[PDB]
Amino acid sequence: TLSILVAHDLQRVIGFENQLPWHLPNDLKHVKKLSTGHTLVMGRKTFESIGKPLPNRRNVVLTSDTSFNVEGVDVIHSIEDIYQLPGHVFIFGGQTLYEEMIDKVDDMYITVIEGKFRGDTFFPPYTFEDWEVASSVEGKLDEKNTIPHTFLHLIRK
Ligand SMILES: NC(=O)C1=CN([C@@H]2O[C@H](COP(=O)(O)OP(=O)(O)OC[C@H]3O[C@@H](n4cnc5c(N)ncnc54)[C@H](OP(=O)(O)O)[C@@H]3O)[C@@H](O)[C@H]2O)C=CC1
Ligand SMILES: COc1cc(-c2c(C)cccc2C)cc([C@H](C)C#Cc2c(C)nc(N)nc2N)c1
Q1: 27 CB under 6 A from ligand 2?
Q2: Is the distance from CB of 123 to CB of 14 less than 8 angstroms?
Q3: What's the CA gap between 96 and 15, in Å, rounded?
Q4: Mutation test residue for ligand 2: of 31, 36, 57, 91, the one with most atoms within 8 Å of CB
Q5: CA angle 8, 91, 115 (to 5 degrees)
Q6: Were 53 and a residue from 59, 82, 148, 154 both cysteine, which residue would form a disulfide, CB within 3.0 to 4.6 Å?
Q7: Is the distance from the beta carbon of residue 111 to the nearest atom of ligand 2 less than 6 Å?
Q8: Exposure class string for 31-62: b at 16+ Cβ within 10 A, else e
């Protein structure tokens, strides 16, 4: 099973200066709950923006660097290698990996951030004519989660 996992804004910004433009604990809980016990595939820059694997799932970094080695991270050097990973595999960023994979994934788990942020990286455009809305759940606003947001599960038609 091949899924996208992404948070994107009203204009499909996903990032700014190798960071997320927003901080939204609800989305981080969402990510952890979806991906615990499973597999995260991410591009090198996305991984390096964090510096350490997320516990309790397989962390897989795609890079052309043959010297790349981090404790608790598995490395792949080709897109083709993704299709050999067992279980539920989540494409986890960044822009380059989304662009490479969006036509290949079965479904997408998208947090729509209902804001317009300054960004330098983007999710690829897509149309709902290719995707069914399996579910659409509004996130609760509070003092810790102050941007409106929607959890979408889309499945390729
Ligand atoms: N809003 C969100 O849900 C998320 C946002 N982000 C954001 O995205 C941004 C980073 O995105 P982006 O700049 O596109 O970088 P990526 O994280 O996608 O990394 C790009 C790198 O991935 C490696 N790579 C990609 N494709 C291949 C391939 N086919 N073969 C071998 N290696 C490959 C290369 O590594 P190398 O150069 O070492 O060869 C490449 O330079 C940051 O702003 C981050 O915060 C990231 C995830 C989620
Ligand atoms: C192990 O490498 C990473 C770890 C984290 C990370 C998480 C998910 C929770 C707590 C702490 C950390 C460091 C994040 C990322 C990237 C930036 C991403 C992402 C992302 C987010 C935030 N939301 C939705 N919906 N999709 C996403 N792909 C990479």
Answers
A1: yes
A2: yes
A3: 12
A4: 31
A5: 5
A6: 59
A7: yes
A8: beebbeebbbbbbbbbbebeeebbeebbbbbb
Contact between 8 and 110 (Cβ < 8 Å): yes
Report the 10 Å Cβ neighbour count for 149. Answer: 23
What type of residue is 5? L
For residue 70, what is the DSSP state? -
Indicate the resolution in Å. Answer: 2.3
Q: How far apart are CA 7 and CA 62, in angstroms?
A: 20
Question: For residue 134, how far is its CA from the centre of ligand 1 (angstroms)?
Answer: 27
Length of the chain: 157
Distance CA 4, CA 12 (A): 14
